[PDB]
Amino acid sequence: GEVKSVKVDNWGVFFLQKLQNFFNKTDYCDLTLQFRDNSQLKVHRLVLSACTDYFNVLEQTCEIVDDALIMPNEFQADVVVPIVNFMYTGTLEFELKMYGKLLRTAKEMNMTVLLKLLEAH
Amino acid sequence: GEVKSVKVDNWGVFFLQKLQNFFNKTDYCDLTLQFRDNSQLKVHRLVLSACTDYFNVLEQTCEIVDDALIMPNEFQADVVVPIVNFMYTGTLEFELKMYGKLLRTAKEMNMTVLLKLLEAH
């Protein structure tokens, strides 16, 4: 009646890879972000939610059209795409000239893990 | 115009922890599994989907009542609860007498990562 346990090591690594693949192939995505140029980014709410509550506030305060969430003017693909990629990977890819805007954006979201990264000690 | 990048190390570890917390507090859960005794387990579809396609087949073949998915008779809490916990943690906790049933269940799901673990070389 004793409970034993066996484990898979580095589960976070394993699980992470599966999610990135899903994001790439747009499998199991349950939120569509729409930008001013009508381009759209399909994401997993849950991935978003692990790093920030900001998107919870957006779905409560922004327009929903065609099942897609209209992004506010200061939150367009130039900052959202690299921030979302960061959410999936731990890695932020960016042009240096985007540093300030990304940092200000992370602060406005209170996305602590990202602003800590951008502030680099 | 050159793209640089900075990273957070061990992102899988970080992300994993956030998801387990969500599962514990039942935040952002989007699927309710219901067992014969009317008990229910609330989960994230996406976590389920990373290890198996079985639940995709269940939502296409099983009854949906009160927004809850009726689990088939051979798929009750005795195997589902430890298998789902494994999905979130990489760890399978179980009583030895459950070994055979868990292994047969993993095989019926074609949940490769779990049956490999249970077969231990």
Numbering used by the authors:
A (entry chain A), B (entry chain A): 2 to 122
Give verbatim lines from the article.
We propose a general model for insulator function in which BEAF32/dCTCF/Su(HW) provide DNA specificity (first layer proteins) whereas CP190/Chromator are responsible for the physical interactions required for long-range contacts (second layer). BTB/POZ are a family of protein-protein interaction motifs conserved from Drosophila to mammals, and present in a variety of transcriptional regulators.
Overall, the FCCS data strongly suggest that the BTB/POZ domain of CP190 is involved in the direct protein-protein interactions required for the establishment of long-range contacts. The dimer interface (1902 Å2/monomer according to PISA 1.47) is composed of numerous hydrophobic interactions mainly from alpha helices α1 and α2 (i.e. W12, F15, F16, F23, L47…). The native homodimeric organization is also reinforced by the N-terminal strand (residues Glu2 to Asp10) being swapped: the β1 stand of a monomer interacts with the β5 strand of the other monomer.
